[PDB]
Amino acid sequence: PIVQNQMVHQCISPRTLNAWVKVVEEKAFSPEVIPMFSALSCGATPQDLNTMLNTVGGHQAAMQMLKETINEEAAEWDRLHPVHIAPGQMREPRGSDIAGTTSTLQEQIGWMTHNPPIPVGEIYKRWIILGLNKIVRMYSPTSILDIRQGPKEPFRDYVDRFYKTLRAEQASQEVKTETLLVQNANPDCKTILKALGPGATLEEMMTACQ
Amino acid sequence: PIVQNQMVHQCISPRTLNAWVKVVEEKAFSPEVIPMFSALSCGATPQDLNTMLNTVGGHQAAMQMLKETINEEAAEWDRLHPVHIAPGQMREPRGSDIAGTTSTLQEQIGWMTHNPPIPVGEIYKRWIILGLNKIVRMYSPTSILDIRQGPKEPFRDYVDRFYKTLRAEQASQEVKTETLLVQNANPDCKTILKALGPGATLEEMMTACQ
Amino acid sequence: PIVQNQMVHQCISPRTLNAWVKVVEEKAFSPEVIPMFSALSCGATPQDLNTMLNTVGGHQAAMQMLKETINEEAAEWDRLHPVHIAPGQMREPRGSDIAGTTSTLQEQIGWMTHNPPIPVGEIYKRWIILGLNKIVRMYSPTSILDIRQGPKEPFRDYVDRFYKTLRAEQASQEVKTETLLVQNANPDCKTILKALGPGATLEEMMTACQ
Amino acid sequence: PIVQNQMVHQCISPRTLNAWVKVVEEKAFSPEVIPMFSALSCGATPQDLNTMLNTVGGHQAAMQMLKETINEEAAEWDRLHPVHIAPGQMREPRGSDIAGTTSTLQEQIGWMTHNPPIPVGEIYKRWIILGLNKIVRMYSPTSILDIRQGPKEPFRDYVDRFYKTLRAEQASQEVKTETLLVQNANPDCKTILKALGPGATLEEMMTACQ
Amino acid sequence: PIVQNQMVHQCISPRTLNAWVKVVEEKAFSPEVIPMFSALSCGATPQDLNTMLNTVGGHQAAMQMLKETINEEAAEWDRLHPVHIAPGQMREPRGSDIAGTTSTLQEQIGWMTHNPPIPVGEIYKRWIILGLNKIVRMYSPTSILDIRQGPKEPFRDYVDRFYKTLRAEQASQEVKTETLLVQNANPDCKTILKALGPGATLEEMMTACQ
Amino acid sequence: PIVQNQMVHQCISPRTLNAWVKVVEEKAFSPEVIPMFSALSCGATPQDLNTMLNTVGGHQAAMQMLKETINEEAAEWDRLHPVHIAPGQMREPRGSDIAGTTSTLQEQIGWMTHNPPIPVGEIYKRWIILGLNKIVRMYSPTSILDIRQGPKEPFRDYVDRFYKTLRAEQASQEVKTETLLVQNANPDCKTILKALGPGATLEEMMTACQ
Amino acid sequence: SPSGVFTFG
Amino acid sequence: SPSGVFTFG
Amino acid sequence: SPSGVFTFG
Amino acid sequence: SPSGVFTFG
Amino acid sequence: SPSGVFTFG
Amino acid sequence: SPSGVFTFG
């Protein structure tokens, strides 16, 4: 990554490398893996991001889908930012340079530490997260329509299952409580929730069915 | 977080990230999780606080309740601090900027390192702790009225259960020893505690029933 | 804590936080927990000390007794050091300021780094250790009078039990070898120890009964 | 390795040493070991690279094959870069100097920190990776032609097996989805994939057979 | 401990604290614990040394013997270095000051960083090691005279047992191979060792009986 | 060890100490322990090297053999470098000074940081490695002549056993593939290897018998 | 496209 | 509102 | 020669 | 009051 | 004397 | 007195 000493390059740490490999091994593509990826790649160059992705051993269907998404975003970058070499001068990055495929570490450091900075690490991380979002959605095991409270299931446990599924499915903010959460509750809790009226908070609903 | 080098940004560490994820996994919403959260987020930006909250995989009912509390506090901030862009100048943070939703890391660093400093990390942490307090209270499994000493239960173990419950229930300082602790003791210890008279310290009570 | 960079504040580390939580979990209030607490809190502010105490999940009877001791020491401080605000000036700390209840981190740093320094962290740590001493004594499972060497117990193992108990019971230095250690030995070793005469060292006693 | 303080030598860390030994022990020559090697050897001197290779206890057939590849690359270097000692002057590195066999640490530091730099660590790492690539291919347990979807195997699991094998086999980018992945699918999924038409993305194929 | 930044104080680390506690728990008073103690206490003040000793929970017979040895060495120091307070001046350390009993951390730092330095940490560590040596010898389970090679015991394993015992027993360098090692060997190996003649090295003996 | 801050002394770390103790415990004198020792002792003083050797608890036959080798190398040093004290001047190191037996840490630092430097740590490490080499060879369990491929043993596994043994036995580079590896192969693979002709690489042999 | 999984911020 | 769980400080 | 295993970059 | 548990120092 | 175990370098 | 356990140095 790039850190303050002046902005300088520092090697990716064994702690960082191991943390990422282990979270993928333990959590696969549960939604919380994405914020962990983003945090572990703080200040990362494109090289660092590729290291992190390349160190993953399993899940090669997912990694190939990610590669496709990256290539699509690279192509769209080039369409929106075409480029027309001067001795010792900084060249303009293409999509493949942002993805670390046709750029050197030194070029990446040059862009990231320029004034004004061209944040190729942040741009590439955006594309990677777009790809991971698609994978998380595809690998979500359950539709929100199929999360229904059991006859003997505590309301708290049902709500945990409901919002876990909703997070993975990644519907729009508008689509993403006053509707399906009540409809999918069990007969006894539904009767209680209906009586609360419109505009009840989640806290109030959970208290009511506790 | 923001640290002294001059006040500079430093990436959240893998040790910090892992510690928080593990304490939530191991302790859920036992009261001691809150002081741990506060300590692990020392010097945190709003971005760092969101990273910590976003890396939690389970407990999505709790995380949605927390989101509601944050939104309420953001709205109250805006009501109390309205805002009326000058080139290259620091703008005033709204509630959503304090919560890291509409602000950039660079803006957050700008506010936190200003003279005088606008401590958006500390303000946001306050709102988060308010939310966690509510969750800890809701998820408390036992009322203090139901903590009673068993016939063969050592007084020390009963007092441990009593104050564990009292901590989670979070009654006022005034409400929160000379009353219920004695009344809920077993017949033999109660007789001894009654004879001690008014104003007996906890140490004296524990010695008496040992 | 406060460290040399000039004396500056540094966040309490995840390693420190975890070490303290684990020693309490593993050792409870065995006497060696106190020197560990003191070492882990090297350079600590009152805020840091409170963090350490607040992160403890169990043992709430002990933590409430500790709170009582702290309040007593705070009251005695105020009685011995009364206080009679000038713009931008350092105020005098009260008992509750030393305990981190009515003081801010910035005020604590101000006192601790002043010339001459007002070491509020060290003063508070003293009060906390006074409280822990009482807890260690109360929770000592055995009286020194009941530690007697078994007929087949190696002298070394008996002496280990004897001084472990003596450490927890915390009698005065004068009270705290030439008397009870010999009297509580088994018949065969006692005869040997009696023949050694007055002023025998522990090493000599252990050699004699080996 | 060589780090910025000015570019200075720093000892290889116990964390780095242990991480490499453990990944070889746990992953053998699965393809992801190579990116891990490259990341763990960031900034490495030839001495550091040899340390990493020498600390491996098992897999001595592989390590001897690696030695052969290194010797071949060293010989080709000398053929392309012959060398014709001046007191206190930097000499030109031969193949064996790049491999750390006939060069001292001080000479390696001299070359790596020169202006312009002669990056002997990066050159040697290239040769080592060439050798590791051959080992990964040789030790690949399955041909891509033998990866076929089972009658009851989820398409996702088949695609994981397919691209895992493809990665280890290391065919050309051109050879390395629209052909064999469809042909090796089971009867039901193949019928669906055929109907999608030409140019279907992996995401679309995985959705279709889900 | 005291480190170079200028010589400054630094808090004892949680890693150091834990390492010492664990080695005592795992190795008790096997001889190798002493070099580990010395290495873990590199640069230590008397305060640091006391912290390390005080954090030990078990083995209180040993810790009391150590206290006796320290007190003896302190008394001998005072006999050899008597002391006859000037405002703001450095006083002369007594035995009890070297042991950290009557001295403050600031006084210890003053002595250790003086020109010329009074190395109170190194002096105290010497006394502690003298005490530990006695404990290691006392707790040695076997006399060197009782280490004899079994009829079916490999010579290498016998020699391991022999020198392990010799290390714990701590005889003089002169007393501490050409005598007892041969005499205590089994009949077959003894015959071979006798035929080698005088002045045979350990390597030669081990080869002969292999 | 000695590190750059200027060249300064730094305490050996608990991580380094533990890593060495554990590798000896886990690997004994397998050949890969030697490169690990060398890497863990990067920049070490003679004091540091002795600490590492002294912290080993088992294997005392080996440690006594090592002591003999060190003493032999020290004697040869003195024979080749005799020495004929000036106030405040650096004296010349004898063999025993290089081994850390008659030299102080300060003298060692003086020699190692001199201009020109007298690298006593590197000289001593050389002697130690000479000793370890002898131990690794002595403790090698199998002769290379007895490593023969089983009738059903995969060629790869046989080659692993072959070169593992060859590494431990430490024959000359000339003696240390075209001869014994083929002769000790099983009947079926031997026939194939014979047909390959002279000058076949290990890669080619392993491919042929795969 | 999916909305992402960053519940907070 | 709940009083919080910070027993000390 | 084999193409290598660096899927990304 | 109890004497404390700091055997050394 | 033995040749040592440093296969590389 | 015992000779100590520092075999090396």
Author numbering:
A (entry chain A), B (entry chain A), C (entry chain A), D (entry chain A), E (entry chain A), F (entry chain A): 1 to 5, 9 to 87, 91 to 182, 186 to 219
G (entry chain B), H (entry chain B), I (entry chain B), J (entry chain B), K (entry chain B), L (entry chain B): 1410 to 1418
Question: Can I see the authors' text?
Answer:
Here we report crystal structures of assembled HIV-1 CA hexamers with peptides comprising the linear binding epitopes of NUP153 and CPSF6 and the two antiviral compounds PF74 and BI-2. To attempt to explain how these diverse phenotypes are achieved, we carried out interaction studies using a CA that can be assembled into stable hexamers through the formation of engineered disulfide bonds at the NTD-NTD intrahexameric interface.
Crystals of each complex were obtained in two different spacegroups, hexagonal (P6) and orthorhombic (P212121), similar to those reported for the uncomplexed CA hexamer. Meanwhile, NUP153 interacts with residues N53, L56, N57, Q63, M66, Q67, L69, K70, I73, A105, G106, T107 and Y130. In NUP153, an equivalent interaction is mediated by F1417, which superposes closely with CPSF6 F321. ITC binding experiments confirm that this NUP153 residue is essential, as F1417A has no measurable binding to hexamer. Unlike CPSF6313–327, which forms almost a cyclised structure, NUP153 residues 1410–1417 form an extended linear conformation that runs from F1417 across the face of CA helices 2 and 7 from the second monomer. NUP153 also interacts with the end of helix 8, where it meets helices 2 and 7, and hydrogen bonds with R173, Q176 and A177. The side-chain of T1416 interacts directly with CA R173 and with CA Q63 via a water and T1416A abolishes binding by ITC.
